[PDB]
Design a protein around this ligand. Structure first.
Ligand code: ADP
Ligand code: ADP
Ligand code: ADP
Ligand code: ADP
Lengths: 229, 229, 233, 233
């Protein structure tokens, strides 16, 4: 089993699903058996025991936006990912070759930490030749100046590295297309090679996203990086 | 209703309970009606939805160390604190005058954040003449050197201020007693007056703790600070 | 002297200068003697820079002003910054012979960056020396928005405000900068998730002329705020 | 050149010097040419200081080396730090005429303090220039213990390790310093809550003579570790 983990930076609604979706379609296009899974961290659940001087303890919980109960979430994530990845999908009746994992929330979210920890551990179980990750981050731009900015993505990538994952591709999302100078800064200040910086701007129909990925040699990259046929 | 909130710094098992307990006893000694309440944040509950490609969503939870369910924990904390504080205690049949609130966990704990937020908001509802807080922090000391350190407490106090509470007294806990130079540094680098730094070292029976507080003029302080009889 | 400190978040080119400038313009039109100090965190040598302040303290140390003692960023640089601000803020301006009543300090850089920390630390400490009613700070931060969705996002400002708080300053006003006007749902979300009242969230969108910035600031009662917060005549 | 960076956490006087020194002593006894660089974050002027490095770059700027450009802490100070480390690390020592194989860099200060950040940032970047097998970093941190309870606590080391990670370095060894020996329950808790294998948690308690420190380090297989981690002969 090969795995591609997709995470998000700086903001939510950054395009995690579309990137995972698109990577799925691209590889199926080359005749690979590909499965998708999503892990969505739940809006944090805040609890506590309240204790009056001389009367019973009330235990207060907190509604989220609204079922298995495990001892260790971290072990449960890695067991459930490994097992679902095997479940045959589409037709094809056989074990998938690539599993595209979609991690909801944004890197830096308090609620995401246990799941990022899960995958930090997992990358060493999977071994490097069968596991890579892709960080989808924002490059903002105010209309008043036109200047696209790399700082938010710089910081996001550092947060990600801090939590133990090194991004194999950085997907830079932006309103208008990214100019070579800014693409050069991302490469240089996030310490990845130029080819690992993929730029996907806002497009008028989703179909264009896979096309842009392919135009930026994503398949050649995944081929070397995961040893794919 | 007057309120004294007790929080902890740098480490757990810092002596929050003993300080709250001792403050309770001291004020009762002056004939005040005093009640105690404890809020203990629960070991964080990590959840998430897992989603296979073409099969039902499993929702995974996480055991803590093991009941009311509210929309906003922050509002629930402040309502429950205000109401319990009124409940007559000991004999005395009448509404307590002072409520000593004990906040479990340590400032900086992810799980403590909503409750510290609760009290940030609460200090403005209670108004300043009826609300103060007391931060019980560690001053460590290695046997190899003997040198007591203020940095952990400096940082703890900054974290506390960052979350919106300014400590009215800093209670410095340590293995051996604190020397004047270190007591001077705490005062100066945590930006409180000398009299707001109270030092309570490790003692051989709990009874000594209230005595040390009184020796360091805690009652004179609470008198001016809360307008007590 | 009363002091207003303008810092920026998330990105450079966020509008620190225009805000610093507009607050100045607004306050002068209510009859107040306003002065301006600019801090540039760069090393090149009423305007202070890392170069100038470090060269000053290095030179002092080098000729023995500190009597052999160990000289450190905190407190020696940070003392020099505070001593430098207080002395500049007193210098008469705009033709007046009397001491300025207010000093708007513009701190270049973006909060979170290493170059700016000596200055943020200087001001963390300075707010305790000044009374509360003689110092406040304003944080100018990005509310970004992809055209694909049109959703304004508050997370970057949340993380920026939390980092500022981390470094010891708590913003009295959060000026949210966006391409298009911030709507009330998003404006309340900033109030909620940063930890401030609604009236402390000031929204300043991209305008077609910068004279509109002080118009927008006055429209959101910034003078009422500063009167109460700094006790101004 | 291979580099080992020693940093400290929670408190000063935590043992950075003894660890830096003991690693050096241990590695020399396995036949390796070891050199030492000390960084002092103070401003006073193979030993570098904030004063020296800032004075150097200020002077360069002042005479026009950077051709009018804006000079900044990052990259100009941080470049100078990295250029300075590489050049010192090459200089022959201990009587040998050949280039040293390993350089132990001792960074004074405590992680989290402003004075140390230019240096931590220099090394965050430097670890990408060097190969992975030519750079690792060791973090010396406090496991405190009140006599009242006798409970060793890991939270301070957790927060310290997370702050180091925040500044862009991830410790390859956490050296936990305590008054009395750390027991296995607490040793596993550090492995768990910081995010590292058990063999990366090295415990060094207060001893009655500092020669015991390298004895304890070798007892916990630090050489085995460095052989694998830095690919050493
Ligand atoms: N490159 C793009 N161009 C235009 N719209 C996009 C692009 N990428 C994503 N979107 C749209 O933006 C929204 C957010 O995308 P989604 O994949 O759901 O993000 P996330 O998975 O991070 O929530 C969706 O409506 C999606 O169709
Ligand atoms: N000053 C002191 N001297 C000796 N023992 C103390 C002192 N303060 C607290 N203790 C003891 O240390 C332990 C922790 O105290 P506790 O109040 O339960 O801390 P917390 O409320 O922060 O958990 C208890 O066993 C308590 O009796
Ligand atoms: N609200 C706004 N609308 C349009 N343009 C703006 C606005 N605020 C700032 N600008 C412009 O953006 C650029 C950057 O502003 P500036 O104040 O120089 O930012 P900073 O001081 O943060 O670097 C300038 O051209 C400025 O006139
Ligand atoms: N494991 C230890 N046992 C006893 N004393 C120690 C130990 N480690 C360091 N020390 C002593 O503690 C003091 C501080 O050590 P040092 O290495 O100078 O700390 P730093 O370099 O972090 O300032 C010195 O007197 C040193 O000999």
């Amino acid at each position: 089993m090969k795995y591609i983990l997709v995470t998000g930076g700086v903001i939510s609604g950054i395009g995690k699903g579309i990137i995972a979706s698109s990577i799925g379609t691209i590889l199926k296009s080359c005749g690979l058996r590909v499965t998708a899974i999503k892990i969505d961290p739940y809006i944090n659940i805040d609890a506590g025991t309240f204790s009056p001087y001389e009367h019973g303890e009330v235990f207060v919980l907190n509604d989220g936006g609204e079922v298995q109960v495990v001892p260790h979430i971290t072990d449960a994530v890695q067991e459930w990912v490994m097992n679902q990845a095997k479940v045959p999908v589409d037709g094809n009746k056989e074990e998938p070759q690539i599993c595209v994992i979609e991690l909801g929330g944004t890197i830096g979210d308090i609620e995401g930490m246990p799941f990022v920890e899960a995958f930090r551990q997992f990358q060493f179980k999977a071994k490097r030749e069968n596991f890579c990750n892709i960080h989808v981050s924002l490059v903002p731009q105010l209309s008043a100046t036109g200047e696209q900015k790399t700082k938010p993505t710089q910081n996001s990538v550092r947060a990600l590295r801090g939590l133990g994952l090194s991004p194999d591709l950085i997907v830079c999302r932006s309103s208008t297309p990214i100019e070579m100078a800014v693409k050069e800064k991302i490469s240089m200040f996030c310490h990845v090679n130029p080819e690992q910086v993929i730029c996907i701007h806002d497009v008028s129909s989703t179909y264009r996203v896979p096309v842009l990925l392919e135009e930026q040699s994503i398949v050649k990259y995944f081929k070397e990086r995961l040893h794919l046929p």
